[PDB]
Design a protein around this ligand. Structure first.
Ligand SMILES: CCCCCC/C=C\CCCCCCCCCC(=O)O
Ligand SMILES: CCCCCCCO[C@@H]1O[C@H](CO)[C@@H](O)[C@H](O)[C@H]1O
Ligand SMILES: CCCCCCCO[C@@H]1O[C@H](CO)[C@@H](O)[C@H](O)[C@H]1O
Length: 250
Protein backbone atom coordinates (compact mmCIF):
# COMPACT_ATOMS: atom_id res chain seq x y z
CA UNK A 1 0.00 0.00 0.00
CA UNK A 2 2.64 2.55 1.07
CA UNK A 3 4.93 1.27 -1.71
CA UNK A 4 2.02 1.72 -4.17
CA UNK A 5 1.53 5.20 -2.73
CA UNK A 6 5.20 6.18 -3.20
CA UNK A 7 4.98 5.02 -6.82
CA UNK A 8 1.96 7.29 -7.44
CA UNK A 9 3.77 10.20 -5.73
CA UNK A 10 6.80 9.64 -8.00
CA UNK A 11 4.65 9.63 -11.16
CA UNK A 12 3.24 12.96 -9.88
CA UNK A 13 6.75 14.35 -9.27
CA UNK A 14 7.78 13.26 -12.79
CA UNK A 15 4.81 14.60 -14.74
CA UNK A 16 3.73 17.93 -13.22
CA UNK A 17 5.82 21.03 -13.85
CA UNK A 18 4.29 22.87 -10.88
CA UNK A 19 3.87 21.32 -7.41
CA UNK A 20 2.24 22.72 -4.27
CA UNK A 21 5.59 22.71 -2.47
CA UNK A 22 7.06 25.02 -5.13
CA UNK A 23 3.80 27.05 -5.39
CA UNK A 24 3.72 27.92 -1.66
CA UNK A 25 7.38 28.96 -1.61
CA UNK A 26 6.74 31.41 -4.45
CA UNK A 27 3.60 32.66 -2.66
CA UNK A 28 6.03 32.73 0.36
CA UNK A 29 6.59 30.92 6.13
CA UNK A 30 8.58 29.65 3.12
CA UNK A 31 6.26 37.40 -9.37
CA UNK A 32 4.93 40.10 -11.71
CA UNK A 33 1.40 41.18 -10.67
CA UNK A 34 -1.28 41.38 -13.37
CA UNK A 35 -4.23 43.30 -11.94
CA UNK A 36 -5.39 45.46 -14.89
CA UNK A 37 -5.06 45.87 -18.68
CA UNK A 38 -1.66 47.65 -18.59
CA UNK A 39 -0.10 44.93 -16.38
CA UNK A 40 -1.60 42.23 -18.60
CA UNK A 41 -0.03 43.99 -21.59
CA UNK A 42 3.33 44.24 -19.78
CA UNK A 43 3.17 40.50 -18.98
CA UNK A 44 2.32 39.59 -22.61
CA UNK A 45 5.74 41.06 -23.47
CA UNK A 46 7.83 40.94 -20.27
CA UNK A 47 7.42 37.36 -19.02
CA UNK A 48 6.35 36.09 -22.51
CA UNK A 49 4.33 33.20 -21.08
CA UNK A 50 -10.85 39.77 -29.64
CA UNK A 51 -10.94 41.82 -26.40
CA UNK A 52 -9.43 41.55 -22.87
CA UNK A 53 -12.04 39.23 -21.24
CA UNK A 54 -11.80 36.80 -24.21
CA UNK A 55 -8.00 36.92 -24.22
CA UNK A 56 -7.97 35.89 -20.54
CA UNK A 57 -10.39 33.02 -21.37
CA UNK A 58 -8.00 31.89 -24.14
CA UNK A 59 -5.15 31.87 -21.61
CA UNK A 60 -7.37 29.75 -19.32
CA UNK A 61 -7.80 27.32 -22.23
CA UNK A 62 -4.02 27.15 -22.87
CA UNK A 63 -3.59 26.31 -19.19
CA UNK A 64 -6.29 23.61 -18.97
CA UNK A 65 -5.15 21.91 -22.22
CA UNK A 66 -1.53 21.84 -20.97
CA UNK A 67 -2.65 20.35 -17.62
CA UNK A 68 -4.64 17.70 -19.54
CA UNK A 69 -1.35 16.59 -21.20
CA UNK A 70 0.34 16.32 -17.80
CA UNK A 71 -2.57 14.41 -16.25
CA UNK A 72 -2.50 11.98 -19.20
CA UNK A 73 1.23 11.29 -18.65
CA UNK A 74 0.59 11.02 -14.87
CA UNK A 75 -2.19 8.45 -15.44
CA UNK A 76 -0.11 6.49 -18.00
CA UNK A 77 2.76 6.47 -15.47
CA UNK A 78 0.59 4.24 -13.29
CA UNK A 79 0.62 0.52 -14.41
CA UNK A 80 -3.01 -0.43 -13.59
CA UNK A 81 -4.17 2.58 -15.63
CA UNK A 82 -1.93 1.48 -18.54
CA UNK A 83 -3.23 -2.13 -18.40
CA UNK A 84 -6.73 -0.85 -19.27
CA UNK A 85 -7.71 -0.73 -22.93
CA UNK A 86 -7.03 2.69 -24.46
CA UNK A 87 -10.78 3.38 -24.89
CA UNK A 88 -11.30 3.04 -21.13
CA UNK A 89 -8.24 5.30 -20.60
CA UNK A 90 -9.85 8.04 -22.72
CA UNK A 91 -13.26 7.73 -21.02
CA UNK A 92 -11.66 8.13 -17.56
CA UNK A 93 -9.67 11.19 -18.58
CA UNK A 94 -12.66 12.63 -20.44
CA UNK A 95 -14.73 12.80 -17.24
CA UNK A 96 -12.03 13.10 -14.50
CA UNK A 97 -9.58 15.62 -15.88
CA UNK A 98 -11.49 18.82 -14.97
CA UNK A 99 -12.14 17.43 -11.47
CA UNK A 100 -8.36 16.96 -11.11
CA UNK A 101 -7.55 20.34 -12.67
CA UNK A 102 -9.77 22.17 -10.18
CA UNK A 103 -8.40 20.18 -7.23
CA UNK A 104 -4.83 21.08 -8.34
CA UNK A 105 -5.69 24.77 -8.93
CA UNK A 106 -5.93 25.04 -5.13
CA UNK A 107 -2.13 24.45 -4.94
CA UNK A 108 -1.46 27.65 -6.91
CA UNK A 109 -4.20 29.75 -5.28
CA UNK A 110 -4.46 32.03 -2.28
CA UNK A 111 -7.40 34.29 -1.31
CA UNK A 112 -6.00 37.13 -3.44
CA UNK A 113 -5.07 35.44 -6.73
CA UNK A 114 -3.11 32.78 -8.61
CA UNK A 115 0.26 32.04 -10.21
CA UNK A 116 0.50 31.80 -13.97
CA UNK A 117 3.28 31.08 -16.45
CA UNK A 118 5.19 28.57 -14.28
CA UNK A 119 5.19 30.83 -11.19
CA UNK A 120 6.52 33.86 -13.05
CA UNK A 121 3.28 35.91 -12.80
CA UNK A 122 0.49 36.48 -10.30
CA UNK A 123 -3.02 37.37 -11.55
CA UNK A 124 -5.22 38.94 -8.90
CA UNK A 125 -8.64 37.60 -8.04
CA UNK A 126 -10.12 41.12 -8.18
CA UNK A 127 -8.91 41.63 -11.76
CA UNK A 128 -10.53 38.31 -12.82
CA UNK A 129 -13.79 39.47 -11.17
CA UNK A 130 -13.66 42.69 -13.22
CA UNK A 131 -13.99 40.90 -16.57
CA UNK A 132 -17.14 40.80 -18.77
CA UNK A 133 -19.86 38.81 -17.05
CA UNK A 134 -19.72 35.44 -18.73
CA UNK A 135 -15.94 35.24 -18.34
CA UNK A 136 -15.85 36.62 -14.78
CA UNK A 137 -18.45 34.12 -13.51
CA UNK A 138 -16.46 31.01 -14.45
CA UNK A 139 -13.31 31.45 -12.37
CA UNK A 140 -14.76 32.86 -9.12
CA UNK A 141 -16.35 29.55 -7.89
CA UNK A 142 -12.94 27.88 -8.25
CA UNK A 143 -11.47 30.39 -5.74
CA UNK A 144 -14.29 29.70 -3.29
CA UNK A 145 -13.49 25.99 -3.67
CA UNK A 146 -9.72 26.45 -3.43
CA UNK A 147 -9.76 28.45 -0.16
CA UNK A 148 -11.93 25.85 1.60
CA UNK A 149 -9.78 23.12 0.02
CA UNK A 150 -6.49 24.72 1.13
CA UNK A 151 -7.65 24.81 4.79
CA UNK A 152 -7.13 21.01 4.86
CA UNK A 153 -3.35 21.54 4.48
CA UNK A 154 -2.69 18.71 2.06
CA UNK A 155 0.79 18.25 0.65
CA UNK A 156 1.96 16.95 -2.74
CA UNK A 157 2.09 13.30 -1.58
CA UNK A 158 -1.52 13.63 -0.35
CA UNK A 159 -2.47 15.21 -3.71
CA UNK A 160 -0.76 12.53 -5.79
CA UNK A 161 -3.15 9.92 -4.29
CA UNK A 162 -6.26 12.18 -4.25
CA UNK A 163 -5.87 12.96 -7.94
CA UNK A 164 -5.20 9.28 -8.82
CA UNK A 165 -8.54 8.52 -7.08
CA UNK A 166 -10.39 11.20 -9.05
CA UNK A 167 -9.19 9.82 -12.42
CA UNK A 168 -9.63 6.13 -11.58
CA UNK A 169 -13.37 6.46 -10.96
CA UNK A 170 -15.63 3.52 -11.81
CA UNK A 171 -18.68 5.77 -12.10
CA UNK A 172 -17.93 7.36 -15.53
CA UNK A 173 -20.41 7.06 -18.49
CA UNK A 174 -19.55 4.42 -21.11
CA UNK A 175 -16.84 2.69 -19.08
CA UNK A 176 -16.28 -0.75 -20.59
CA UNK A 177 -14.64 -2.53 -17.68
CA UNK A 178 -16.33 -0.98 -14.59
CA UNK A 179 -15.39 -3.65 -12.01
CA UNK A 180 -11.67 -3.46 -12.87
CA UNK A 181 -11.69 0.36 -12.46
CA UNK A 182 -13.63 0.07 -9.17
CA UNK A 183 -10.95 -2.37 -8.00
CA UNK A 184 -8.14 0.11 -8.75
CA UNK A 185 -10.03 2.99 -7.06
CA UNK A 186 -10.65 1.01 -3.88
CA UNK A 187 -6.90 0.30 -3.67
CA UNK A 188 -6.02 3.97 -4.24
CA UNK A 189 -8.53 4.96 -1.52
CA UNK A 190 -7.21 2.42 1.03
CA UNK A 191 -3.73 3.67 0.22
CA UNK A 192 -5.01 7.22 0.81
CA UNK A 193 -6.51 6.68 4.30
CA UNK A 194 -3.39 4.76 5.38
CA UNK A 195 -1.14 7.54 4.04
CA UNK A 196 -3.16 10.17 5.93
CA UNK A 197 -2.84 8.16 9.17
CA UNK A 198 0.92 8.46 8.77
CA UNK A 199 1.24 11.94 7.18
CA UNK A 200 -1.45 13.73 9.23
CA UNK A 201 -1.56 11.90 12.62
CA UNK A 202 -3.53 14.60 14.45
CA UNK A 203 -6.17 15.54 11.85
CA UNK A 204 -9.55 14.00 12.69
CA UNK A 205 -12.13 13.11 10.00
CA UNK A 206 -9.66 14.09 7.21
CA UNK A 207 -10.40 11.02 5.06
CA UNK A 208 -14.21 11.43 5.01
CA UNK A 209 -13.64 15.13 4.32
CA UNK A 210 -11.63 14.41 1.15
CA UNK A 211 -14.42 12.10 -0.03
CA UNK A 212 -16.93 14.92 0.40
CA UNK A 213 -14.47 17.13 -1.55
CA UNK A 214 -14.48 14.59 -4.42
CA UNK A 215 -18.26 14.82 -4.43
CA UNK A 216 -18.02 18.63 -4.33
CA UNK A 217 -15.58 18.51 -7.25
CA UNK A 218 -18.15 16.53 -9.26
CA UNK A 219 -20.67 19.35 -8.68
CA UNK A 220 -18.12 22.09 -9.51
CA UNK A 221 -17.47 20.48 -12.92
CA UNK A 222 -21.23 20.13 -13.45
CA UNK A 223 -21.62 23.93 -13.02
CA UNK A 224 -18.45 24.62 -14.98
CA UNK A 225 -19.84 22.61 -17.94
CA UNK A 226 -23.14 24.54 -17.71
CA UNK A 227 -21.23 27.83 -17.94
CA UNK A 228 -19.17 26.47 -20.84
CA UNK A 229 -22.41 25.63 -22.68
CA UNK A 230 -23.65 29.24 -22.31
CA UNK A 231 -20.36 30.68 -23.65
CA UNK A 232 -20.73 28.34 -26.66
CA UNK A 233 -24.34 29.48 -27.25
CA UNK A 234 -24.02 33.22 -26.54
CA UNK A 235 -20.34 34.07 -27.22
CA UNK A 236 -20.17 33.44 -30.99
CA UNK A 237 -16.78 35.18 -31.48
CA UNK A 238 -14.71 33.25 -28.93
CA UNK A 239 -12.84 30.21 -30.27
CA UNK A 240 -12.97 26.94 -28.37
CA UNK A 241 -10.02 24.50 -28.43
CA UNK A 242 -11.07 21.27 -30.27
CA UNK A 243 -9.84 18.92 -27.45
CA UNK A 244 -11.97 20.76 -24.87
CA UNK A 245 -14.79 20.62 -27.44
CA UNK A 246 -14.28 16.80 -27.47
CA UNK A 247 -14.67 16.75 -23.64
CA UNK A 248 -17.92 18.76 -23.37
CA UNK A 249 -19.95 17.15 -26.21
CA UNK A 250 -21.90 15.11 -23.59
C1 LIG B 1 -4.10 36.55 -18.15
C2 LIG B 1 -3.80 35.44 -17.16
C3 LIG B 1 -5.02 34.53 -16.97
C4 LIG B 1 -4.58 33.14 -16.50
C5 LIG B 1 -5.78 32.18 -16.39
C6 LIG B 1 -5.31 30.73 -16.27
C7 LIG B 1 -5.20 30.35 -14.93
C8 LIG B 1 -5.75 29.20 -14.36
C9 LIG B 1 -6.51 28.24 -15.03
C10 LIG B 1 -7.90 28.10 -14.40
C11 LIG B 1 -8.94 28.82 -15.26
C12 LIG B 1 -10.37 28.41 -14.87
C13 LIG B 1 -10.99 27.51 -15.94
C14 LIG B 1 -11.49 28.30 -17.15
C15 LIG B 1 -12.10 27.36 -18.19
C16 LIG B 1 -11.11 27.04 -19.30
C17 LIG B 1 -11.72 26.11 -20.35
C18 LIG B 1 -11.97 24.69 -19.81
O1 LIG B 1 -11.03 23.87 -19.85
O2 LIG B 1 -13.12 24.46 -19.37
C1 LIG C 1 -7.53 -0.17 -27.32
C2 LIG C 1 -8.15 0.58 -28.49
C3 LIG C 1 -9.21 -0.30 -29.15
C4 LIG C 1 -10.16 0.51 -30.02
C5 LIG C 1 -11.54 0.64 -29.39
C6 LIG C 1 -11.99 2.10 -29.45
C7 LIG C 1 -13.47 2.22 -29.77
O1 LIG C 1 -14.20 2.66 -28.64
C8 LIG C 1 -14.58 4.03 -28.72
O2 LIG C 1 -14.14 4.60 -27.49
C9 LIG C 1 -14.47 5.97 -27.24
C10 LIG C 1 -13.98 6.33 -25.85
O3 LIG C 1 -12.57 6.12 -25.77
C11 LIG C 1 -15.99 6.17 -27.31
O4 LIG C 1 -16.28 7.56 -27.19
C12 LIG C 1 -16.57 5.62 -28.61
O5 LIG C 1 -18.01 5.70 -28.54
C13 LIG C 1 -16.11 4.18 -28.86
O6 LIG C 1 -16.53 3.76 -30.17
C1 LIG D 1 -5.57 13.12 -23.78
C2 LIG D 1 -6.79 12.68 -22.98
C3 LIG D 1 -7.94 13.68 -23.06
C4 LIG D 1 -8.93 13.30 -24.16
C5 LIG D 1 -10.36 13.55 -23.72
C6 LIG D 1 -11.26 13.86 -24.90
C7 LIG D 1 -12.30 12.76 -25.08
O1 LIG D 1 -13.05 12.97 -26.27
C8 LIG D 1 -13.71 11.77 -26.69
O2 LIG D 1 -12.83 11.00 -27.53
C9 LIG D 1 -13.36 9.72 -27.90
C10 LIG D 1 -12.27 8.86 -28.54
O3 LIG D 1 -12.27 8.96 -29.97
C11 LIG D 1 -14.60 9.96 -28.77
O4 LIG D 1 -15.16 8.72 -29.15
C12 LIG D 1 -15.62 10.76 -27.96
O5 LIG D 1 -16.80 11.02 -28.73
C13 LIG D 1 -14.99 12.07 -27.48
O6 LIG D 1 -15.93 12.81 -26.69
Amino acid sequence: LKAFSKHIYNAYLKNFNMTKKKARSILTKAPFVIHDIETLWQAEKGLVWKEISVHVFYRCQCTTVETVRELTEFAKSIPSFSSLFLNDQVTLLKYGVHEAIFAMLASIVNKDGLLVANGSGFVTREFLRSLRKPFSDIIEPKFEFAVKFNALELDDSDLALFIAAIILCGDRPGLMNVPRVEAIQDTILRALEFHLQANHPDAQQLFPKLLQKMADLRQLVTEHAQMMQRIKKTETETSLHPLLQEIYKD
